């Protein structure tokens, strides 16, 4: 007989979680999947192994249907004729191959039918190496990562993360006369990701984090003790560290049914002399926000902070990537310098902070998006 | 033997009934007169390829069907009417059809005009009646009607065969030298050819729906109507919706069409030693146009002789009491821009500027220019745009522009490149779809200083000068400006001159014939009145206006005076 | 660096109405035929072939005549274009046998079962050798005299593995048509196979040349063909002429069954080769279906 | 047995059956029962059937499109499954619709008895368009298993390809003996035919095919700005792609927010023309069944824009409504709200009730909401009732969420800011489509606001060039643009709605009126409302204001005011069927207020002076005043309500009219 194989009856997405340092530290254990690598320690001599990366994500692809395998229906012999698919690019069948059409004289015609094809939700990610693993004068590397099946939309721009996957080689891509040998293209197809930082959203009141949480709650004196901890490198400054506790938690944003909105996300200015640690505590509230963005006056232009329109290759369209106050979405946007800001970027955060959307007329598109920093 | 369409040959015994039989009563005496006979013989005399066929004299026959038959299916009756015309020629003038000739039967006057829109794909291939305002002509150019092929292996040639839209090539090789069809060899030299013009037309300004942009048409252009179709005016084109090949449709959403190979009545054998020929079907709308009427780019040739034999006698009298009437410069004066209250001097340089002066060139060859320009320059709110938008509504061959919209390959002329190829084409500017005319700018301060000197090096030389990409080219543009300017500070300055209050360069300045400027003071009667013309304005729409002479006939007196040489 | 994608079918809707005319049809019918059939009270075909996969006799002898009892229109078909119904009735022959030595050796406690060989016998009217015309020519036909040679047993290629001289592309090719004399209707591809399949992802311009395939001989298989060349005999010959005689090409098992001089009625496809007299003239032969041996000597 | 559909769930009989009990027995009150409202359930209205009623005026009306709620199908027991088959497998669940719908038809007639004939019941192909299929998830929230499912989009259009005629049946004509033939499409493939069909002529490949006999069908690609109801972390706002077919074709125009509902597709692109080598990762789009472009918490678009395009969408048979259908219970609700004393104060107190006190503010942007009547000329002019309003003031004096209602409210308005903002983007421009790569014109804010209100938010932001783009918008209604590839003018008929504050950030008495506000005389001359909006520090005014903004807050989902729906219908109705005119009573008010003002600008820049503008506003604020109160005509009471807003927008009873400054302490009152 012939019958639908396995691959045309699984419901499920198969990933292998990498075994912990501390389970290989118990039993003397020695893996090169638990320990993090940088883009640039990945060598070839990594390909087909499940390896661990650990980098910023830089750019996340839209999820796309990648078929697999496509399936044809015949009207001539009823059969149904599935090609598989494992390239960029494909080629359709015309005449039937099923043993009845191949047998006779007559060949059916094959139809596509999107049903009963198999797909995978695809996404193509970009992994930087993080600033302390690129080497003295050298500039941050990059790999490509193929998030396929139920892991997509795990992967966000900005996220500090450590992405396990296998190291696969890919056909060659670029130009033909400078190519040696069988040179090929390398991605990571991710199998398990995890959070440096934790989002807030994601965040469900299990039974390990609730005895977390009562012990904080029964130590005692929570306010106080949070704010001496969010720099106890910085003396002093109990005030401006405790407004700093309330920037991170937030007030409650109001919705009225009528419509509009009142924000809850809280705005906070540090302004003062040189020498009071104004910058350490901003780079400290990004190191504790999980969606912390820290920028500077004139480093951050008006194009790095509202939006750009480009090309995704990939899914081949125009999209509209984001500045750094898209990017610190839902999370606390920390601008260094505030004084030395250009008119377009204090418009900019002049909508932001009371708005907290951003609307763009130009020649590009005409658009609002949604930015919800809280800013300092 | 061929098969025969029964409905085409009614429609053509129909036709060449309708050729023959139809007449109509005369005005003047009465007399029962066959129109299409007379428009052969008229055809014979001057040897003319097209005849003009009204549409409601083929709709009163019968009780509408045969109008209907053929406009419906104009692109399939279309062969049936040519050779009913050839047989009704041949009975009557049979000298017409020696030089065999290309006849071309032009419709007109159609019950209703669509717009460009309003264009749907159930019409493909059916009598319509559209109208736009063409922006781009192309050169007429030869379109391969009857071709003359040489089959290789016989090296013998045949003749008229026919060219439907795509090139194709017989199959048929009735020389039975070979047995192979596929290879033929065109030989342009005795090849037969057309008459071809795609111009592109744009939707008109009062069509354009609530949000949307315009969208453009190719019409084309055969025969006799090449060269009717002009960059800049309203145009109303009578023909038939075609459809042709488009590639740029692959990467659009949609289940695109294919048309594969049919393979079941096909014996074949495992022998061994698959591949089948499958082409796309993507398409675009595009009108083959018969009839070319340019109706007014207004709301509603120099020889004095050949205008005065246009006119009838009604209107050549009105002309002639019009002119015999004394005051008639004051009526003139009065006639212009009957909205704006006051500002009597402006409607008289409007007036002069409509009327303009001669163009004298002198011997050693530099060119006296005769165009008048009109600046306005004064306070807000002095009804300054209301002449410009008036001069725009009445004079022909006018536009209107903002100083800000504006651009300097926008007001002059563009290099435009189409669908990313190899060729480039020029798309003519606001100073040349008003050559000869009036060009209309708002906000001429608001213009920055790069399309100023666009603007006036077309000024100086009275040409437009293009090197762009591939191109070079010298193109006119003999026009009058219009412009509206406000001073620096919004006020006028009444402390400064007039070089200081406007900020526009001494070259745009130097070649102003007449600068007005107005001025706003507030006195009781004044304002009283324009407050009273205002709101009787809004009150009484078209009554609070009551010109001297409507805006037809000062159009008629403006091109009667136009031939004159003072 | 990936595989081979891969293409499967599974039945799933009716489709179509069947047709007689369709080859899957013929060989149902066929099968039919070969398991249903009764001489008088047992199935004589399915216990000849099953005693012939027994004593590994890759072989099924077939009376004519039963397919007159059982279905007429088989019996035209395979009469009147009998190239093209014979590997039909070979296919059906050869999906029994799969299915019947499978339950056999897991029963009466790998193995490769080549295409079965169809032979067939009759006693219908005997056509003699000078009757012989065109209408006859790619028909089956039955024939007798006697066999002045047999000649030596050539070797054949049924399954032959092919490798690519330089691009060392893997190939095999399965011959199941030996009938034809004097003309290779199968041959080696005159090019590589590699460029077309596009079988790798990579696709490593590149040509192997003509005629880049090699044949492996110990991965391939051979049969064994005879030639057989048969007069009219000689006690009805008219006085003043030479006898006339045909050329026949037998292969398989009906190869070393007669020996030159034995009497023979034969069933054969009277068919056509170009020997390389007239423009266009074919020198006419036999490809024997079955033999049958009117005398046997002793 | 039971036989299904390969693939699917669904059975033919079993859901023909069950969709017909739903037609002949689905009553309103089981949806009112399913929405949970019990209290709401009346007599007459939902007692009656529904669905049997629509098909007895589809009949009537000569229509074949209907409107199906699947929420409805949700409401009825025995279609409880069909919904989800509804909505898993569109395709052939809607024909299965379309064959009950076409037996109903046939059956309501052949059981009463009726004179209507069958044959065009017959003849007549039904369809059924399903609408409110779930909630608006977006579609970078869609998964590959939701390919083919019936989805709901809200969003704005941006732009709209020309019709493309895609083909459906194909018309194939031999070369040698002429004869002629029509092939149907099968899955967007054609066959066309190896050999002549006639016994006597046999030729191979003598068949050729001739694209202007064939039969073709209308498709068109929009593309749609999607603004889902929920946006994820860093999510920037993308563009879809989706295809409408046959009567839907032009029924949506640039810059309109509408509610596409259709089924989600997914189809491969070829990588090169030359080639038949197709893409691997799939591009996905969506096939559009129903469009509605109507809502009830905002207002309809105006009528009087949308005139030439309502007489095509007549021909055309879409059957697609841009306006709300008024009946006579709410109709005669209307009239008798209308009847009230305090009408005027109700419906400014009823516009943002979140937002304290403002109420000659609100007033002003009720009267620009309902507008001036529009009139054209026979000759070929054109006046247009746009009321323009600039809101300068303190900050926090809850004008952004001003803007922020107005941009809600409006039907196609555009919300922007200043120095976020350029002319180009303002006007038009050409960009690269992703699909053709083609250069295509793409509209501005201006263009896309036109018929609705463009609010621009900190106005004093934006830069002297790019205002000078709003002057011809202001004052004409058009933008008249001349560039490489447009030149045309553009009809733009939006009202400008801007927010700006003083030099200083904060209004400064000792500086006149003019410098605080910081605006050329030409742009200035162009706003018939400007308002002076300040904060005066005040015991029981911040009391009441604390009071107010505090309340909301004590729970956790926040006079008499009317409820939007209503309000946005009332206002529709009056902007719709109310052309007031203007009559010599109100005229000479007109002049005598006129020239009064004109009078008293003689006094010495440092004073807004009167402006033949503010005359048209005079005129424009009395119409829509007039329009309100459903009068047909303009009387001295709107005149006198008009002049009086003006001098109380701008606070001319506090300024001095000499030196122009404005005193806090004598003469506001908070
Ligand atoms: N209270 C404090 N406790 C600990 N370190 C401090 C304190 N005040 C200043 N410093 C240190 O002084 C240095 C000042 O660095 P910055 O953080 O850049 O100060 P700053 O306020 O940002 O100065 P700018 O950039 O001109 S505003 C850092 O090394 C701080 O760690
Ligand atoms: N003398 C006048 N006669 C008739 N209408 C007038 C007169 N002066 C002003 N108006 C009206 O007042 C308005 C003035 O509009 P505009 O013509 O645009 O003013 P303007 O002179 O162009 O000044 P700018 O440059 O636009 S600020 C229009 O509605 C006119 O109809
Ligand atoms: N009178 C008021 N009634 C209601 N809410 C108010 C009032 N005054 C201020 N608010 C609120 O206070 C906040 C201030 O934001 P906005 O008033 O929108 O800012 P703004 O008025 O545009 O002034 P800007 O942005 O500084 S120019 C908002 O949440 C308003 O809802
Ligand atoms: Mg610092
Ligand atoms: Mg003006
Ligand atoms: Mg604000
Ligand atoms: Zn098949
Ligand atoms: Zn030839
Ligand atoms: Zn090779
Ligand atoms: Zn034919």
């Given at each position: 007989?012939?019958l639908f194989?396995?691959?045309?009856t699984?419901?499920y997405?198969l ?8 389970c290989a530290?118990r039993?003397?254990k020695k893996?090169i999947?638990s320990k993090?690598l940088?883009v640039?320690?990945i060598?070839?001599?990594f390909?087909?192994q ?10 996340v ?10 399936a044809?229906?015949?009207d001539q012999?009823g059969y149904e004729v599935?090609?598989?698919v494992?390239?960029?690019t494909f ?6 191959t099923?043993?009845?059409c191949?047998q006779?004289?007559?060949?059916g015609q094959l139809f596509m ?12 990610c970009?992994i930087?190496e993080?600033?302390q693993q690129?080497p003295?004068?050298h500039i ?6 193929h ?6 939309r795990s992967?966000?721009?900005?996220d ?6 296998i190291?696969l080689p ?9 190519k040696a040998?069988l040179?090929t293209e ?8 995890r959070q440096?930082?934790?989002?807030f ?5 299990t039974?390990d984090?609730?005895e ?5 709650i029964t130590?005692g004196?929570?306010y106080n003790?949070?704010?001496k901890?969010?720099?106890?490198e ?10 700093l506790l309330?920037?991170?938690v ?6 009225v049914?009528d419509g509009?909105?009142?924000r809850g996300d809280?705005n906070?200015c540090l302004?003062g ?5 104004k910058?350490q505590?901003?780079k400290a ?7 912390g963005?820290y920028?500077?006056?004139?480093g951050?232009?008006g194009?790095?902070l509202?939006?750009?329109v480009?090309?995704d ?8 990537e984001?500045?750094?106050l898209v990017?610190a979405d839902?999370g606390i ?5 505030f004084?030395?800001?250009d008119?377009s970027?204090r418009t900019a955060?002049?909508?932001?902070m ?5 609307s763009?007329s130009?020649a ?8 919800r920093?809280?800013?300092? | 033997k061929?098969v025969?369409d ?20 005369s005005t003047d005496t009465?007399?029962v007169?066959?129109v299409?006979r007379a428009?052969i ?7 003319l390829?097209?005849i003009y ?7 009163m026959?019968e009780n509408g069907?045969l109008?209907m038959?053929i406009?419906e299916?104009?692109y399939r ?5 040519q050779?009913?015309?050839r047989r009704?020629?041949?009975?009557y003038?049979?000298?017409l059809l020696n030089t065999?000739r290309?006849?071309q039967?032009?419709?007109?006057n159609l019950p209703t005009?669509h717009?460009?829109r309003?264009?749907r794909?159930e ?5 319509l009646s559209?109208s736009?305002?063409?922006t781009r002509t192309?050169?007429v150019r030869?379109e391969?009607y009857?071709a003359s092929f040489?089959?290789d ?9 026919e060219q439907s ?5 017989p199959?048929?090789c009735?020389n039975?030298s070979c047995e192979?069809?596929?290879?033929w060899?065109?030989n342009?030299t005795?090849?037969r050819?057309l008459?071809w013009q795609k111009?592109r037309?744009?939707e008109?300004?009062?069509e ?7 969208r453009?048409?190719d ?6 109507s090449?060269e ?8 109303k ?5 075609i459809?042709?090949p488009?590639?740029t449709?692959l990467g659009?959403?949609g ?5 594969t190979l049919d393979?079941?009545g096909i014996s074949?054998?495992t022998?061994?030693l698959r591949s089948?020929?499958?082409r796309?079907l993507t398409y675009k709308?595009?009108?083959l146009?018969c009839?070319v ?12 002789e ?9 209107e050549?009298?009105?002309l ?5 009437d004394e005051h008639?410069?004051?009526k ?18 409007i007036?002069?500027?409509?009327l303009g002066?001669v163009?004298?060139?002198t011997?050693?060859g530099?060119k006296?220019?005769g165009?008048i320009n ?9 009804s ?15 536009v209107?522009?903002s100083?800000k ?6 007001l ?6 189409d669908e990313?190829?190899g060729?480039?084409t020029?798309?003519?500017?606001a100073?040349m779809?008003?050559?000869?005319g009036?060009?209309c700018?708002?906000?001429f301060?608001?213009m ?10 077309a000024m100086?030389?009275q ?10 080219a010298?193109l006119?543009?003999r026009?009058?400006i219009?412009?509206?300017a ?6 006028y300055?009444?402390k400064?001159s007039?070089?200081?209050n406007?900020?526009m360069?001494?070259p745009?300045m130097?070649?102003?014939?007449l ?5 706003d003071?507030?006195n009781?009667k ?9 709101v009787?304005?809004h009150?009484?729409?078209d009554e609070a ?8 006939q000062?159009?008629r007196?403006i091109?009667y005076?136009?031939t004159?040489?003072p | 660096?990936?595989d081979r994608?891969?293409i499967?079918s599974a039945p799933?809707?009716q489709?179509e109405?069947?047709?007689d005319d ?7 019918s066929?099968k ?5 059939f009764?001489?008088?009270?047992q ?9 012939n ?6 072989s099924?002898?077939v009376?004519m005549?039963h ?5 007429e229109?088989?019996?035209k078909?395979?009469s009147?274009?009998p ?16 299915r019947?030595?499978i339950?056999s050796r897991?029963?009466s406690?790998?193995?490769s079962?080549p295409?079965?060989?169809?032979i067939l016998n009759?006693?219908?009217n005997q056509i003699?050798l000078?009757?012989?015309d065109?209408?006859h ?7 007798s005299?006697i066999?002045?040679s047999?000649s030596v047993?050539?070797?054949?290629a049924?399954?032959?593995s092919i490798?690519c ?6 190939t095999?090719i399965?011959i199941?048509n030996f009938?034809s004399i004097?003309?290779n ?7 590589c196979l590699?460029?077309?399949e596009s079988?790798?992802?990579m ?5 192997c040349?003509?005629?880049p395939?090699?044949?492996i001989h110990?991965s391939?298989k051979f049969i064994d063909?005879?030639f ?7 006690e009805?010959?008219?006085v003043?002429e030479?006898p006339?005689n045909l ?6 098992y009906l190869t070393?069954?007669?020996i030159?001089?034995?009497r ?7 068919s056509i080769?170009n ?6 003239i074919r020198?006419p032969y ?5 033999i ?7 | 047995?039971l036989?299904?559909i390969?693939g699917?769930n669904?059975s ?14 689905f009553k309103?009150?089981?949806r ?10 009346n007599n007459?209205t939902?007692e009656?059937?529904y669905?049997?009623k629509?098909?007895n005026?589809?009949?009537?009306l000569?229509?074949?499109?209907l409107?199906l709620?699947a ?7 025995q ?6 088959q509804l ?5 052939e669940?809607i024909?299965?619709?379309d064959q009950?719908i076409?037996d109903?038809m046939?059956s ?5 008895n009726?004179?209507?004939?069958l ?7 039904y ?5 409110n299929?779930?909630?608006?998830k977006?579609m970078?929230?869609?998964n590959?298993?939701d390919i083919?499912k019936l989805?709901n989009l809200?969003?704005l259009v941006?732009?709209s ?5 895609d083909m459906?049946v194909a018309?194939?004509?031999?070369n ?8 149907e499409?099968?899955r ?5 035919p190896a050999?002549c069909?006639?016994?006597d002529?046999?030729?191979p490949?003598?068949?050729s095919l001739?694209?202007?006999r064939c039969?073709?069908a ?6 749609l700005?999607?603004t889902?109801?929920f ?6 706002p ?11 074709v032009?029924?949506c125009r640039?810059?309109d ?9 997914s189809?491969p692109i070829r990588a090169?023309?030359?080639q038949?080598?197709?893409?691997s990762?799939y591009?996905?789009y969506?096939?559009v ?6 809502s009830?918490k ?8 949308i005139?030439?395009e ?6 055309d048979?879409?059957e697609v ?6 009946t006579?219970?709410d109709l ?5 709200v209308?009847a009230?004393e ?8 009823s516009?943002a009730?979140?937002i304290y006190?403002?109420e000659?503010?609100?007033?002003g942007?009720?009267?620009q909401?309902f507008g001036?009547t529009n009139?054209?000329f026979t000759?070929?002019?054109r006046?247009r009732?746009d009321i ?16 922020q209602?107005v941009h809600?409210?409006?039907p196609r308005g555009?919300?922007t ?6 002319a ?8 690269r ?11 501005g804010?201006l263009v896309?606001?036109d ?13 002297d060039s790019?205002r ?7 004052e004409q209604?058009?933008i008249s ?5 447009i ?6 008929r939006?009202?400008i709605?801007a927010?700006?504050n003083?030099i ?5 008495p000792?500086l006149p009126?003019?410098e605080?506000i910081?605006?050329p005389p030409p742009l200035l001359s ?7 909006v300040?904060?005066?520090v ?6 009441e ?8 807050y004590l729970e956790?989902?926040p006079?008499?005011?009317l ?7 009332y206002?529709?109705?009056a902007?719709?069927?109310i052309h007031?005119?203007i009559t010599?009573?109100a005229?000479t008010?007109?002049?005598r207020a006129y ?10 820049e440092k004073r ?5 503008r503010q005359?048209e506003?005079?005129?424009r604020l009395?119409?829509?005043?007039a329009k309100?109160?459903?009068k ?5 009471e709107?005149?006198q ?7 109380s927008?701008?606070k001319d009873y506090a300024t ?6 404005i005193?806090?302490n004598?003469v506001q009152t908070?």
């Open positions: 007989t012939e194989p396995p691959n045309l699984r419901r997405f990933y292998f979680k990498p075994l912990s340092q501390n530290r039993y003397r893996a999947s993090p940088s640039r320690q060598k070839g001599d390909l087909g499940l390896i661990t990366v650990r980098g910023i994500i830089t750019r692809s839209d999820v796309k249907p990648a078929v697999e395998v496509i044809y229906t015949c012999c599935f090609q598989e494992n390239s960029r080629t359709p069948l015309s005449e039937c099923s043993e009845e191949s006779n004289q007559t060949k039918s999107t049903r009963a094809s198999k797909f995978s939700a695809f996404q193509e970009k930087q993080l600033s690129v003295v004068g941050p590397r990059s790999l490509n990562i998030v396929n099946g139920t892991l997509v992967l966000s721009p900005g500090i993360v450590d992405v396990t996957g190291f890919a056909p060659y891509t670029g130009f033909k006369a400078l040998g040179l390398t991605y990571l197809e991710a199998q398990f990701v440096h930082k934790k989002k959203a994601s965040f469900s009141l039974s984090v609730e977390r949480v009562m012990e904080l130590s004196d929570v003790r949070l704010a901890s969010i720099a106890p910085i003396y002093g400054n109990l005030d401006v560290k405790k407004a309330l920037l991170l937030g007030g409650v944003d109001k919705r049914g509009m909105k009142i809280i906070v302004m002399d040189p020498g009071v640690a910058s505590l901003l509230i990004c190191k504790i926000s999980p969606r963005v920028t500077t006056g004139k951050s232009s194009v790095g509202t939006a750009a480009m090309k290759p990939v899914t081949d369209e125009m999209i509209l984001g500045g750094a990017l839902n946007c920390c601008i260094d310098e004084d030395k800001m008119e970027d955060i002049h909508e932001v009371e708005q907290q959307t951003i763009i130009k590009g598109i005409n658009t609002t998006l949604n930015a920093t809280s800013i300092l | 061929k025969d029964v409905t085409g040959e009614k429609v053509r015994e129909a036709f060449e009934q309708f050729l023959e039989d139809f007449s109509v009563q009465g007399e007169e066959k299409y428009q013989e008229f055809m014979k005399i001057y040897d390829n097209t066929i009204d549409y409601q004299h083929l709709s026959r069907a109008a038959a406009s299916q104009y009756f279309l062969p049936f009417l050779k009913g015309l009704v020629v041949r009975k003038a049979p000298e065999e290309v006849f039967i032009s419709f007109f005009v717009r460009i309003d264009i794909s019409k493909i291939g059916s009598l559209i736009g305002t063409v192309s050169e030869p391969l009857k040489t089959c292996m016989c090296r013998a040639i045949v003749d008229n065969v839209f795509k090139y194709t090539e199959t048929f009735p039975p192979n069809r596929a290879f060899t065109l342009v005795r090849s050819f008459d111009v037309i744009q008109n300004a009062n354009i729906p609530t949000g949307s942009m315009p453009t048409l019409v084309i252009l055969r025969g006799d090449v009717r179709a002009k960059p800049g005016d309203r145009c084109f009578t023909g038939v919706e459809v042709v488009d590639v449709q659009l959403p289940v695109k069409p294919s048309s393979t079941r074949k054998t022998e061994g089948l020929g499958v796309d709308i595009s009108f146009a009839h009427i340019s109706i007014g780019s207004n709301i509603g040739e120099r020889d004095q050949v205008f005065l034999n246009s006119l009838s006698s009604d050549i009298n009105e002639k009491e019009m002119v015999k008639i410069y004051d003139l004066v009065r006639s212009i821009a009957p909205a704006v209250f006051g500002h009597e001097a402006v409607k008289k340089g007036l002069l500027q409509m002066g163009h004298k060139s011997v050693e530099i006296l220019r165009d009109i600046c306005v320059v004064g306070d807000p709110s002095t300054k745009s209301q002449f410009l938008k008036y001069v725009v509504g009445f004079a022909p061959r006018s209107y522009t100083g919209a504006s651009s300097a390959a926008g002059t002329a563009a290099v435009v490149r990313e190829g060729d480039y020029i798309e003519a500017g100073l779809l008003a050559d000869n009036i060009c700018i708002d906000e301060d608001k920055d200083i790069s399309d100023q000197v666009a603007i006036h090096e100086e030389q040409t437009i000068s293009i090197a762009k990409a591939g191109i070079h010298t006119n543009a026009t009058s219009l412009a509206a406000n001073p620096v500070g919004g006020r300055n009444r400064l007039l070089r200081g406007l900020n360069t001494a745009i130097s070649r102003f014939d600068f007005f400027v107005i001025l003071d507030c009781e004044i304002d009283t009145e324009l407050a009273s013309h205002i009787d304005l009150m009484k729409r206006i009551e010109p001297p002479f409507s805006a037809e000062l159009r007196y091109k005076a136009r004159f040489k | 660096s990936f994608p891969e499967y799933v809707l489709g109405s069947p047709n369709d080859n899957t049809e013929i060989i149902k066929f039919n035929f070969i398991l249903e009764r001489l008088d009270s199935f004589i075909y399915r216990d000849q072939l099953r005693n996969i027994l004593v590994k006799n890759y099924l002898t009376n005549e397919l007159i009892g059982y279905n229109d088989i019996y078909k395979l009147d274009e190239s093209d119904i014979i590997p039909l009735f070979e296919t059906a022959i050869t999906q029994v046998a799969k019947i030595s339950l897991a029963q406690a790998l193995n079962l295409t079965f060989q169809l009759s006693n219908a003699p000078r009757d012989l065109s209408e020519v790619s028909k089956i036909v039955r024939l005299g066999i002045i047999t047993l050539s070797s054949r049924t399954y032959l490798m001289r330089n691009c060392r592309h893997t095999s399965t199941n009938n004097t003309g209707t199968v041959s080696l591809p005159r090019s590699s460029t077309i079988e790798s992802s696709a490593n311009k590149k040509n040349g003509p005629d395939y090699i044949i110990e391939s063909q005879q057989l060349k048969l007069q009219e005999i000689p009805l010959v008219p003043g030479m006339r050329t026949m090409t037998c292969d398989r070393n069954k007669v030159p001089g034995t023979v009625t034969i069933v054969g496809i009277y080769y020997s390389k007299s007239g423009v266009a020198t036999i490809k024997i279906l079955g049958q041996s009117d005398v046997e000597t002793s | 047995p036989r299904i390969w699917t669904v033919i009989q079993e859901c023909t059956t069950n969709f017909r009990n739903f037609l002949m027995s309103y009150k089981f009112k029962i399913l929405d949970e409202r019990e209290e709401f359930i007459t939902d009656e059937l669905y049997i629509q098909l005026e589809m009949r009537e000569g229509t074949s499109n409107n709620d929420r409805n199908l949700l409401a009825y027991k279609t409880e499954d069909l919904y989800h909505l898993n497998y569109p395709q669940v024909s299965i619709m009950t076409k109903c046939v309501l007639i052949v059981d009463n009726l004179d209507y004939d044959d065009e019941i017959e003849t007549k192909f369809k059924v368009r399903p609408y299929v779930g909630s608006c977006g970078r929230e869609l590959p298993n083919d989805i809200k969003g941006l732009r390809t020309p019709v493309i005629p459906k018309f194939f004509k031999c040698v003996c002429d004869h002629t033939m029509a092939v499409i099968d967007g493939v054609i066959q066309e050999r069909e006639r016994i002529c046999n030729e490949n003598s068949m001739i694209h202007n039969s073709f209308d498709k068109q690609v929009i593309k700005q999607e889902p109801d946006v994820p972390d860093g999510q920037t993308h563009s879809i792609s989706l295809c409408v077919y046959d009567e839907l032009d029924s640039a810059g927010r509408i509610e596409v509902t259709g089924t989600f597709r189809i090169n023309s030359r038949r080598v197709l893409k990762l591009k996905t969506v096939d069944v129903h469009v509605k472009k109507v009830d905002r207002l309809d678009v105006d009528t009087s824009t005139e030439q309502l007489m095509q969408n007549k021909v048979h879409n409504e841009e306006v709300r259908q008024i006579d219970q005669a609700k209307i009239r008798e209308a009230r305090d009408l005027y104060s109700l419906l400014a107190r516009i009730p979140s006190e403002l000659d503010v609100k007033k942007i009720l009267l909401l001036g009139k054209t000759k070929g002019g006046y009732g323009n309003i600039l809101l300068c003031g303190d900050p926090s004096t809850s004008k952004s969420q001003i803007l209602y809600k409210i409006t555009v919300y800011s200043g120095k976020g903002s350029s180009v983007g303002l006007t038009a421009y050409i960009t489509d992703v699909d053709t790569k083609q250069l295509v014109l793409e509209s804010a896309l606001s018929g609705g209100v463009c609010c621009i938010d900190e106005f004093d932001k934006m830069s790019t000078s783009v709003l002057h011809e918008v202001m209604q058009t643009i001349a560039k490489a590839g030149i045309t003018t553009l009809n733009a939006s009202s709605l927010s700006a003083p200083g950030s904060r209004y400064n000792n009126v003019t605080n910081d605006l162009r706003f018939d409302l400007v308002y002076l300040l904060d005066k005040d015991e029981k005014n911040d009391r204001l604390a009071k107010h903004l505090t309340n909301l956790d989902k006079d008499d005011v409820p939007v729906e209503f309000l946005t219908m206002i529709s109705y902007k719709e069927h007031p005119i010599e009573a005229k008010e007109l002049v020239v009064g003002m004109r009078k008293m600008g003689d006094d010495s807004i002076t009167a402006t033949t005359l506003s005079m005129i009395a119409e829509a005043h309100m109160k459903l047909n005509v303009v009387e001295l709107d005149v309500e008009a002049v009086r807003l003006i001098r927008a701008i001095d009219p000499k030196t122009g400054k005193d806090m004598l908070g």
